[PDB]
Design a protein around this ligand. Structure first.
Ligand code: GDP
Length: 139
């Protein structure tokens, strides 16, 4: 179950930090892990890049947010669908240096028909929520 939770974003947004937090539960390749989400026991196979896509930007990195659009166009163009499980993640919410406003990310996730989750991989704030939210978009 559950290919491939491909985690994709601009360098240094926190794709590695988020994933290892999920798998290895510590703040610092592919991973497979049996999880329970809303009662179901399923397998996450997670591709941390260097079926479902976790699209990550950093809330202090404006370029990494504007890159979101290219990732989306490349996803619609490869799955031939405007409904492929995908979640927009605003990482690094623990920082005060926010150049990307919550509303912007949300208005973008809106026009895509996809959820938006603000996260911190440093604190584990909202990490399960982001991945588990990606799985719920399959259902
Ligand atoms: N303050 C803060 N720093 C972070 C967060 N996520 C990642 N980092 C830092 O950003 C650096 C690079 O992030 P990384 O996990 O390598 O993202 P990746 O290169 O896209 O895989 C790491 O040294 C982390 O310590 C976060 O949520 N908050």
């Amino acid at each position: 179950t559950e290919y491939k939770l491909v985690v994709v974003g601009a360098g240094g947004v926190g794709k590695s930090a988020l994933t290892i937090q999920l798998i290895q539960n510590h703040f610092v390749d592919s991973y497979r892990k049996q999880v329970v989400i809303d009662g179901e026991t399923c397998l996450l196979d997670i591709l941390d890049t260097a079926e479902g896509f976790l699209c990550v930007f950093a809330i202090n990195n404006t370029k990494s947010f504007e890159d979101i659009h290219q990732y989306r166009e490349q996803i619609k163009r490869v799955k031939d669908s405007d409904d492929v499980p995908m979640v927009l993640v605003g990482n690094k919410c623990d920082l005060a240096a926010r150049t990307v406003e919550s509303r912007q990310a949300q208005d973008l996730a809106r026009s895509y028909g996809i959820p938006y989750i603000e996260t911190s991989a440093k604190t584990r704030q909202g990490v399960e929520d982001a991945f588990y939210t990606l799985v719920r978009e399959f259902r």
